[PDB]
Paper text:
In many of these fungi, the major secreted enzymes are glycoside hydrolase family 7 (GH7) cellobiohydrolases (CBH). CBHs within GH7 are readily distinguished because several loops are further elongated, effectively enclosing the active site in a tunnel. This enables the CBHs to act processively along a cellulose chain and cleave off numerous cellobiose units before detachment from the substrate, which is believed to be key to their efficiency on highly crystalline cellulose. The GH7 CBHs of T. harzianum (ThaCel7A) and T. atroviride (TatCel7A) share the GH7_CD-linker-CBM1 bimodular organization and are very similar to each other and to TreCel7A, with ~ 80% pairwise sequence identities.
The TatCel7A_CD protein was successfully crystallized, and two structures were solved, one apo structure without sugars bound (APO) and one thio-cellotrioside complex (SG3). In the SG3 structure, from co-crystallization with thio-linked cellotriose, there are two cellotrioside molecules bound to each protein chain, in subsites − 6/− 5/− 4 and + 1/+ 2/+ 3, respectively. For the ligand in the − 6/− 5/− 4 position at the tunnel entrance, all glucose residues adopt the 4C1 chair conformation, but the C1 hydroxyl at the reducing end in subsite − 4 is predominantly in the α-position, with very weak density for a β-hydroxyl. The binding may represent a sliding intermediate during processive cellulose hydrolysis. The other thio-cellotrioside molecule in the SG3 structure, at + 1/+ 2/+ 3, is in register and aligns well with the glycan binding at the product sites of the TreCel7A Michaelis complex. The + 1 and + 2 glucosides are in 4C1 chair conformations, whereas the + 3 unit at the reducing end adopts a 1S3 skew conformation, again with α-hydroxyl predominance at the anomeric carbon. Overall, the TatCel7A_CD structures are very similar (0.18 Å root mean square deviation, RMSD), although there is a general ‘tightening’ of the protein around the active site in SG3 compared to APO, which is most pronounced at the A4-loop near the product sites.
Numbering used by the authors: 1 to 430
């Protein structure tokens, strides 16, 4: 896509800490940028909208390449339109923001400069952050995660992307998302189908695949930590059902693992570890520090709340695994007990570790779930299963919860606050 400037693009500042062996940390002057899908797109250098509602303009966008030549991305009013504000090392993402239109959530990337995403190499290192999930009810997901995106949003590989990282281009994840309007310097117009249940979104003929490490997908009720390997580490474009994922007739027909080797303490039999109030080890009405440590043998997790360190609880009642670590043993035992082969089919932890040994971009987001109402995270899922089915119970939310239209009307002032990001070698951030 091109760049237009009727709305200025200024990346909100966000400080974070880089820590080194010894425990010394220094402040880093980062910024955040909104993902390109959220932007107004119109004719370059001016003219009609190229996309409006959930349909493309056929005149401006008769095919994928022409559309990218004729259409530009605009700047974003971060607070007024998208409900994104920063203060020092704190980032707030509001749920429903009404200005011209109703906007629901946002996806942001941490920047090293105004034209480059920050790239984190996770293996042998740890990532720590503080979060307030107190205003995240059933059906919402405040997510912090890593994806194997290009630092420049694809600009050097795809010269028809003139917007680059400055405008939040180049997203990919292990779902191989097809809802993206621009992928690899081309629009996603050919075969585009508008969503049945969402006036603002649709599903294109292409998706955008890459490795994904979901550090944190959570609300006040449940949380999950999930590696997703892909057969190619970095970004590749997929077509239709061969993207796999939720919007494809064969979930497992692609090159990425859309399921992941997920660790949700509730799903693994600990019903008192994480929840609202003093009945829970980690009280979701109060700030939580979440620390995640990556090594070749596995991923480890601890939490700090009110100065108290709590290690990840042991898996409880999971046949053949009594640890608290995402390692090859756990991932295999999970597949055996709960079903499925996707994670190991796509190379498992060995293949994930290849992405963890290269740069990944930090994503901070808030969303609700049109496909499955976040029931996979915080309720009983699938709907045909019940709490006696192995792996079915993931949280205490009602199976009727999380319908986007309902949560948007009932809980519009929901929000997530991420803060005090720290990164460095294992043992260095605490
Ligand atoms: C849940 O985790 C807590 C905190 O680690 C632990 O004390 C408790 O024993 C765990 N519950 C079960 C059923 O294992
Ligand atoms: O799609 C057009 C629409 O996009 C949104 S994102 C803009 O904020 C608005 O001004 C414009 O009319
Ligand atoms: O409303 C803000 C923004 O939302 C997204 S959903 C629209 O596609 C864009 O035109 C505008
Ligand atoms: O797509 C929804 C949800 O599906 C589950 S299977 C994945 O583990 C998670 O990362 C993703 O956000
Ligand atoms: O939660 C793990 C995984 O469960 C399966 S059953 C869901 O369909 C998917 O979105 C995710
Ligand atoms: O893809 C862009 C769209 O993303 C989300 O669905 C937002 O709720 C909407 O406002 C826009
Ligand atoms: O397709 C994904 C679903 O299938 C798996 O085998 C699991 O049992 C279920 O929790 C999910
Ligand atoms: Ni194609
Ligand atoms: Ni119980």
């Amino acid at each position: 896509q091109q760049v237009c400037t009727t709305q200025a693009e200024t990346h909100p500042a966000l400080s974070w800490s880089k820590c080194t062996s010894g425990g010394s940390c220094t402040t880093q002057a980062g910024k955040v940028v909104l993902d390109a899908n959220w932007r107004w797109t119109h004719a370059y250098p001016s003219g009609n909208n190229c996309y409006n509602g959930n349909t493309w303009d056929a005149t401006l966008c008769p095919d994928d390449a022409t559309c990218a030549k004729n259409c530009c991305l605009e700047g974003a009013d971060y607070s007024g339109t998208y409900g994104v504000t920063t203060s020092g090392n704190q980032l707030t993402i509001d749920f429903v923001t009404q200005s011209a239109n109703k906007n629901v959530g946002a996806r942001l990337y941490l920047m090293a400069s105004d034209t480059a995403y920050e790239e984190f190499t996770l293996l042998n290192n740890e990532f720590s952050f503080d979060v307030d999930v107190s205003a995240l009810p059933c059906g919402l997901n405040g997510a912090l995660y890593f994806v194997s995106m290009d630092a420049d949003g694809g600009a050097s590989k795809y010269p028809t992307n003139l917007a680059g990282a400055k405008y939040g281009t180049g997203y990919c994840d292990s779902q191989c998302p097809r809802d993206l309007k621009f992928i690899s310097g081309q629009a996603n117009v050919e075969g585009w189908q508008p969503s049945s249940n969402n006036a603002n979104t649709g599903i294109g003929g292409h998706g955008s695949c890459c490795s994904e490490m979901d550090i944190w997908e959570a609300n006040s009720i449940s949380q999950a930590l999930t590696p997703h390997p892909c057969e190619t580490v970095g970004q590749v474009t997929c077509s239709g059902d061969d993207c796999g994922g939720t919007y494809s007739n064969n979930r497992y027909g692609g090159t990425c693992d859309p399921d992941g080797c997920d660790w949700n303490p509730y799903r693994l039999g600990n019903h008192t570890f994480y929840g609202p109030g003093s009945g829970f080890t980690v009280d979701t009405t109060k700030k939580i520090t979440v620390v995640t440590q990556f090594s070749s043998t596995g991923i480890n997790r601890y939490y700090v709340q009110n100065g108290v360190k709590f290690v990840q609880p042991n898996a409880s009642g999971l046949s053949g695994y009594t640890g608290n670590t995402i390692n090859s043993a756990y991932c295999s035992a999970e597949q055996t007990a709960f079903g499925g082969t996707s994670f190991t089919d796509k190379g498992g932890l060995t293949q994930m570790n290849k992405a963890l040994s290269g740069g990944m971009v930090l994503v901070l987001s808030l969303w609700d779930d049109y496909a499955a109402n976040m029931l996979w995270l915080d309720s009983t899922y699938p709907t045909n299963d019940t709490a006696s089915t192995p792996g079915a119970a993931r949280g205490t939310c009602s199976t009727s919860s999380g319908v986007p239209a309902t949560v948007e009307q009932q809980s519009p002032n929901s929000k997530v606050v991420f803060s005090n990001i720290k990164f460095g070698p294992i043992g260095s951030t605490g």
